[PDB]
C-alpha cells in the first residue's frame, strides 16, 4: 500500500549502503525500467511503518543486504516525481546470494567509489547524487 504525507507527496525511505565504517565505497542496485542505470535502493514506506524499518526492508528486497543502521542523512523531495525520502546510513554486514529483486526481475548490485555513485547517478537521479552531498 502507498503512503503519502498531508501534501501529496509518496512517503520512501532509502539506504547509503556502505561497504565499511569508512563510508568510502557505497552499493547501487539497477533500474528495473532501465537496467543499464543506477539508482539507490529504497522504495515505498507501508502504512504506520517507521521510515528506518522501511529502508532496511527496502534495502532487503532491492539490494540484497543487511547490516547496522546508522543516522539519517535527512529527508530528501523529489519535485518532478512527487516523492519525499528519508535517507538512513547502513553499514552493510550480511551480503545475500539469492535475494527478492534478483530472483523476481535479474536487478543488479554494484560497489562504487563515492565519487563514482554521484557521477553515474547525477543524469537521471540528481536529487540521489545530492543524498551524498553531506
Ligand atoms: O522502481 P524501479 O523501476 O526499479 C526504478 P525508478 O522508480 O527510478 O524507475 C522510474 C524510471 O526511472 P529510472 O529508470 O531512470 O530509474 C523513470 O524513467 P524516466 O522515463 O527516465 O523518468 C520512469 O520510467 P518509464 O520511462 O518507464 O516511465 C518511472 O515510471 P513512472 O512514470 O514514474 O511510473 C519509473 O518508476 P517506476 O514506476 O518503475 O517506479
Same mark, same amino acid.
Given at each position: 500500500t502507498r503512503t503519502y504525507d498531508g501534501d501529496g507527496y509518496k512517503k520512501r525511505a532509502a539506504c547509503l549502503?556502505? *561497504? &565499511? /565504517? &569508512? /563510508?568510502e565505497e557505497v552499493l547501487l542496485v539497477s533500474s &528495473? *525500467?532501465?537496467?543499464?542505470r543506477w539508482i539507490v535502493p529504497g522504495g515505498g514506506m507501508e502504512p504506520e511503518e517507521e521510515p528506518s524499518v522501511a529502508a532496511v526492508r527496502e534495502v532487503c528486497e532491492e539490494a540484497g543486504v543487511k547490516g547496522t543502521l546508522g543516522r539519517l542523512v535527512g529527508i530528501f523531495e523529489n519535485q518532478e516525481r512527487k516523492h519525499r525520502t528519508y535517507v538512513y546510513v547502513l553499514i552493510v554486514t550480511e551480503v545475500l546470494e539469492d535475494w527478492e529483486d534478483s530472483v523476481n526481475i535479474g536487478r543488479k548490485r554494484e560497489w562504487f567509489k563515492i565519487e563514482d555513485a554521484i557521477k553515474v547517478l547525477q543524469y537521471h537521479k540528481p536529487v540521489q547524487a545530492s543524498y551524498f552531498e553531506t
Open positions: 549502503c556502505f *561497504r &565499511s /565504517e &569508512s /563510508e &528495473s *525500467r532501465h537496467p543499464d
